[PDB]
Design a protein around this ligand. Structure first.
Ligand SMILES: CC(C)(C)NC(=O)NC1CCN(C(=O)[C@H](Cc2cccc(C(=N)N)c2)NS(=O)(=O)c2cccc(-c3cccc(C(=N)N)c3)c2)CC1
Ligand SMILES: [Ca+2]
Length: 223
């Protein structure tokens, strides 16, 4: 996260870290057994880390649980990132408490101008590299589809939306991928891609979760 703030320990209790020897992506807990992330975060050997603040220090509220299966969206395209969504099942159910909590799925898509909370352990620099160890947060509005498409002509599908600031300086970035965009209590987005980070006229692009609720509900019930 570039241009954000330190969230505070366990203040985003649905945020997970995906670990394969090291943090490589975020995700969101949607019930005690299941995590939503980006399809571009797919790999073998995932351990889900819940209850995290400092990802380099054991602080006492963590749960570490291996994935038992991963399901990438049937129509995911790894070039364009259309349908950039994946479900991860936990080998054992998480123990839900005030520091390890699920986030609700959308009941519809959200309006442009609505404010959202974007979070992660990704790079905090728009030029160069610095990785925080504590969770970072950013408040950012959903942008209109027209301003999203004008920034990214020929690239945006109905399964994507932009959020952030056209002036630059405030955005998600590398290592935030797969993490949450929460607006009015609903998981409306997944950190997906952008052109660089925090650049002028290059806002963040997010998977439009509202289009996937039926697929999520049916997939988890049959797995
Ligand atoms: N792993 C992995 O293999 N894939 C990852 C690499 C990292 N990544 C990025 O998007 C990076 C950093 C990033 C991450 C998250 C959020 C932001 C943000 N600014 N909010 C920025 N930007 S990139 O270097 O420009 C880049 C690098 C590679 C591909 C693209 C890409 C993908 C699809 C469509 C398009 C298109 N142009 N239409 C462009 C773009 C997400 C995909
Ligand atoms: Ca920790």
């Amino acid at each position: 996260i570039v241009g954000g703030y330190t969230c505070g320990a366990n203040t985003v209790p649905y945020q997970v870290s995906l670990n394969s020897g090291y943090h490589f992506c975020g995700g969101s807990l949607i019930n005690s057994q299941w995590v939503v992330s980006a399809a571009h975060c797919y790999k073998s050997g995932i351990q889900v880390r819940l209850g995290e603040d400092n990802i380099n220090v054991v602080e006492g509220n963590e749960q570490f649980i291996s994935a038992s299966k991963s399901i990438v969206h049937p129509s995911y395209n790894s070039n364009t990132l259309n349908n950039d969504i994946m479900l991860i099942k936990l080998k054992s159910a998480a123990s839900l408490n005030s520091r390890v909590a699920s986030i609700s799925l959308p009941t519809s898509c959200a309006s442009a101008g609505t404010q959202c909370l974007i979070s992660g352990w990704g790079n905090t620099k728009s030029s160069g590299t610095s990785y925080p160890d504590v969770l970072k947060c950013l408040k950012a509005p959903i942008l209109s589809d027209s301003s999203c498409k004008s920034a990214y002509p020929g690239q945006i599908t109905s399964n994507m939306f932009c959020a952030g600031y056209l002036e630059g300086g405030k955005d998600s970035c590398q290592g935030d991928s797969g993490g949450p965009v929460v607006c009015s209590g609903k998981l409306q987005g997944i950190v997906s891609w952008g052109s660089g980070c925090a650049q002028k006229n290059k806002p963040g692009v997010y998977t439009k979760v509202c289009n996937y609720v039926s697929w999520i509900k049916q997939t988890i019930a049959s797995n």
